[PDB]
Amino acid sequence: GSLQQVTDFGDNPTNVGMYIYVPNNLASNPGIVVAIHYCTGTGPGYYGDSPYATLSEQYGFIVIYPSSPYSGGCWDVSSQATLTHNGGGNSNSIANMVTWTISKYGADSSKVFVTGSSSGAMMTNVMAATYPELFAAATVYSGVSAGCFYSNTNQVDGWNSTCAQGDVITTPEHWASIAEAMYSGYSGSRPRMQIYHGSIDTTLYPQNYYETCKQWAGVFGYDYSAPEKTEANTPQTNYETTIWGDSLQGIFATGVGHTVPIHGDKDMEWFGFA
Amino acid sequence: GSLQQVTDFGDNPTNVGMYIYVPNNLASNPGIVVAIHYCTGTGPGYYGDSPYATLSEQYGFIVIYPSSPYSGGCWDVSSQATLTHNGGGNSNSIANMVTWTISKYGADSSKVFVTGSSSGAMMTNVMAATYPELFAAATVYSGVSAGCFYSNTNQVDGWNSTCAQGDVITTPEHWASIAEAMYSGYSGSRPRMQIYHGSIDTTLYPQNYYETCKQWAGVFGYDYSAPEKTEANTPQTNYETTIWGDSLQGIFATGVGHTVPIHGDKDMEWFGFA
Ligand SMILES: *[C@@H]1O[C@H](CO)[C@@H](O[C@@H]2O[C@H](CO)[C@@H](O)[C@H](O)[C@H]2NC(C)=O)[C@H](O)[C@H]1NC(C)=O
Ligand SMILES: *[C@@H]1O[C@H](CO)[C@@H](O[C@@H]2O[C@H](CO)[C@@H](O)[C@H](O)[C@H]2NC(C)=O)[C@H](O)[C@H]1NC(C)=O
Ligand code: NA
Ligand code: NA
Ligand code: NA
Ligand code: NA
């Protein structure tokens, strides 16, 4: 099919770009995958460097690639605007790309997923907390927990070094409260979360794996210290999968740095296309 | 602050009409109320005969008034098309009105509600079952359970006398199966259901109230025989409210026939605007 830029998709004061890949083999009622790029990247760049456009020709979903407006290409995952439901930041623009696409293509709103890598993984967690209503499931490749990049001076697209270096450590309860405040009083459904992180990540250090799993455990009321199951060498040698429940699993990749390589077929399974 | 007809809102093979009321006091991130008319009526008729446009000026949400394409003005709540997620029937059309409005007005997709009287209350149950993903909550004014108007010959807009007379009686399990089958395999968010009916209804017999409460009890995993709470004279004298749980309450109006009059302020409370 083709990658098209869309410029009028709804309110977008932070000027995020929107690109979509509409497959040739478009399903009758297509799903949506939102695939969110890393720093120094762009939406078309992530299109070029991820399996989603290929998989969309198999499964017939539309892929949305949001594109950062900021110098350096990171996502704003620090401002109040981006860290609040309807706050008007980058995350709100991404939400609007979703709803534009659902209406324009008759996409199935119950089959909308979000995934990303590095900065886009940070944004994935933020999308899950700020627009939980939009997403059935999410897959995070090497990010930080929602609100870990909080700026204590309301900076937009600010890098939080304390968080990245793994110095921010707290309880499931505290992280859950932080995620909950991104949509205060929301009690509806939330996407099922899958969190990947590598053990030799020297950009977003591995403590962030545990902080993120703590967060979603706290959000879904799972006992962080008592997972349901742990699967060795799953999905492959030196990856370990911890399942806390239907709405949370973490995959820790020993010997892997920034970022954990996208596992496209595994994504299709978690989302439910496969 | 006007009622507008909308003509190109997405796939609409059964040619349902779409009318919307956009209030003057429109909220920044408006909710949506879908208000579904009775037999012999139309969307604009229900606009003229319900409190929702008046209330939209208080609470700032948009109202969508679908309009039956059929002679006699009843809704198709009988065909396989209308009784299946993405089946292409009237229900599918109403779904598309929702998604069009979300995108066009930047409406909040977590704040979308559906309600209706008589034929429109039947369609309300159908919408909850066929497009559960769209709706946070629903209020049913004197309808029949989803799939009670099933046509054994796949008739479109067929009246089922056995159902209307109150002669279709089955279990929570069986009604829940009927509802589940309208979107098979779905296990996400569904609207919180509020069901009104009058004890002396001789159009849609009051057995249908109990069949509907059974249906939603089965769907949500509630014990139909053990509701959480009963409230005398609630919301008013001779009405009684039974709460089965967060996602189901029934309101039986003793001495009221077809239909139970709309309690607009109570709808606001159930929906969460108030
Ligand atoms: C960087 O990120 C952390 C969170 O990862 C921020 O820490 C929060 O800071 C406030 C005080 O400003 C505390 O009340 C919270 O309890 C902290 N949260 C947690 C989970 O610890 C921190 O403020 C950020 N730093 C900068 C410089 O913006
Ligand atoms: C009228 O409606 C009822 C459902 O309310 C239909 O009943 C179903 O009929 C099929 C056989 O066609 C049975 O297998 C189901 O068990 C019945 N369901 C229930 C809940 O009883 C009935 O067929 C409809 N009548 C007509 C003439 O279409
Ligand atoms: Na469709
Ligand atoms: Na791609
Ligand atoms: Na939704
Ligand atoms: Na908005």
Tokens standing for B33?
């109320």
Cα–Cα–Cα angle for B120, B121, B122, rounded to 5 degrees = 90
d(CA A123, CA A113): 13
Nearest CA among A29, A19, A31, A28 for reference residue A55 = A31
- Residues whose CB is less than 8 angstroms from the CB of residue A228 and which lie 6 or more positions away in sequence, other chains included: A243, A244, A245
Q: Which residue of chain A is at minimal alpha-carbon distance from B93?
A: A106
Cα–Cα–Cα angle for B125, A110, B26, rounded to 5 degrees = 75
* CB burial readout A6-28, b (16+ within 10 A) else e: eeebbebebebbbbbbbbeebbe
Chain mean position to CA A43: 14
SS (H, E, C) chain B: CEEEEECCCCCCCCCCEEEEEECCCCCCCCCEEEEECCCCCCHHHHHHCCCHHHHHHHHCCEEEEEECCCCCCCCCCCCCCCCCCCCCCHHHHHHHHHHHHHHHHCCCCCCEEEEEECHHHHHHHHHHHHCHHHCCEEEEECCCCCCCCCCCCCCCCCCCHHHHCCCCCCCHHHHHHHHHHCCCCCCCCCCEEEEEEECCCCCCCCHHHHHHHHHHHHHHCCCCCCCCEEECCCCCCCEEEEEEECCEEEEEECCCCCCCCCCHHHHHHHHCCC
Chain mean position to CA B238: 23
Phi and psi of A208, rounded to 5°?
-65, -30
By three-state DSSP, how is residue A272 classified?
coil
Residue B171 Cβ < 6 Å to ligand 2: no
B109, A99: Cβ pair inside 8 Å? yes
Report the gap between the CA of B32 and the closest CA in chain A (Å).
14
- Say if residues B116 and B143 touch (Cβ distance below 8 Å): yes
Q: How many domains are there within chain B?
A: 1
- Say if residues A128 and A190 touch (Cβ distance below 8 Å): yes
Cα–Cα–Cα angle for B145, B63, B52, rounded to 5 degrees = 80
Residue B134, CA distances (Å) to A42, A143, B94 in order? 31, 30, 11
By three-state DSSP, how is residue A137 classified?
strand
At B143, which amino acid appears? G
d(CA B96, CA A106): 7
Beta strands A192-198 and A248-253: pairing type? parallel
Cα–Cα–Cα angle for A54, B189, B214, rounded to 5 degrees = 135
d(CA A216, CA A31): 24
- Say if residues A111 and A61 touch (Cβ distance below 8 Å): yes
Instruction: Find the DSSP H helices in chain A.
Output: 43-48, 52-59, 90-105, 119-130, 161-164, 172-180, 207-220, 264-271
A104 neighbourhood in chain B, CB within 8 Å:
103
By three-state DSSP, how is residue A200 classified?
coil
Q: What ligand is nearest to the CA atom of residue B133?
A: 5
State the residue range of the domain holding A223: 1-274
Nearest CA among A5, A113, A122 for reference residue A67 = A5
**Residue A222: enclosing H or E segment and its boundaries?**
none
Beta bridge partners of B65: B19
Which residue's CA is the closest to the ligand 1 atom numbered 12? Answer: A152
Nearest CA among A261, A273, A206 for reference residue A31 = A273
**Residue A42: enclosing H or E segment and its boundaries?**
none
d(CA A99, CA B99): 7
d(CA B10, CA B131): 15
Tokens standing for A241?
């999968």
Cα–Cα–Cα angle for A141, A143, A149, rounded to 5 degrees = 160
Beta bridge partners of B141: B117, B196
Residue count of chain B, please give it: 274
d(CA B212, CA B16): 26
- Say if residues B131 and B66 touch (Cβ distance below 8 Å): no
d(CA B178, CA B154): 15
Ligand 1: atom nearest CA of A155 is 28
- Say if residues A212 and A159 touch (Cβ distance below 8 Å): no
Q: Which residue of chain A is at minimal alpha-carbon distance from B185?
A: A272
What is the rounded radius of gyration, in angstroms, for the C-alpha atoms of chain B? 17
A99, B102: Cβ pair inside 8 Å? yes
Nearest CA among B5, B48, B19, B74 for reference residue B262 = B48
**Given CA atoms B260, B263, B264, B270 in this order, what sign does their dihedral have?**
negative
d(CA B6, CA A260): 47
Is A145 noted as a catalytic residue in this protein? no
d(CA A120, CA A192): 17
By three-state DSSP, how is residue A216 classified?
helix
**Residue A261: enclosing H or E segment and its boundaries?**
none
Query: By what technique were these coordinates determined?
Result: X-ray
Tokens standing for A176?
């859950």
Beta bridge partners of A65: A19
d(CA B74, CA B37): 8
Residue B249, CA distances (Å) to B143, B172, B253 in order? 15, 15, 13
d(CA A14, CA B184): 40
By three-state DSSP, how is residue A5 classified?
strand
Asked if the bond preceding B230 is cis, omega within 30° of 0, the reply is no
Tokens standing for B118?
């008589």
Q: How many CA atoms lie within 13 A of A107 on its CB side?
A: 30
Final resolution, Å: 1.9
**Residue A241: enclosing H or E segment and its boundaries?**
strand A239-245
- Residues whose CB is less than 8 angstroms from the CB of residue B119 and which lie 6 or more positions away in sequence, other chains included: B36, B37, B38, B39, B68, B73, B74, B75, B77, B143
Chain mean position to CA A172: 19
d(CA B219, CA B125): 12
Cα–Cα–Cα angle for A266, A53, B98, rounded to 5 degrees = 90
SS (H, E, C) A64-126: EEEECCCCCCCCCCCCCCCCCCCCCCHHHHHHHHHHHHHHHHCCCCCCEEEEEECHHHHHHHH
| A233-242: long-range contacts, CB 8 A cutoff, minimum separation 24 | A235/A263, A235/A266, A242/A213
d(CA A87, CA A131): 11
User: How far, in Å, is the centroid of ligand 5 from the Cα of B32?
Assistant: 13
**B220: burial class by Cβ within 10 Å (0-12, 13-18, 19+)?**
middle
At B19, which amino acid appears? Y
Sheet with B32-36, side-by-side order of all strands: B2-6, B17-22, B62-67, B32-36, B112-117, B137-141, B192-198, B248-253, B239-245, B229-231
Q: Which residue has the tokens 């059929």?
A: B70
Nearest CA among B125, B111, B94 for reference residue B209 = B125
Residue A164, CA distances (Å) to A30, A83, A148, B263 in order? 36, 17, 8, 53
* Closest residue to A189, CB basis, from B85, B102, B189: B189
- Say if residues B91 and B123 touch (Cβ distance below 8 Å): yes
Report the gap between the CA of B157 and the closest CA in chain A (Å).
24
Q: Which residue has the tokens 């930080």?
A: A144
Sheet with A137-141, side-by-side order of all strands: A2-5, A17-22, A62-67, A32-36, A112-117, A137-141, A192-198, A248-253, A239-245, A229-231
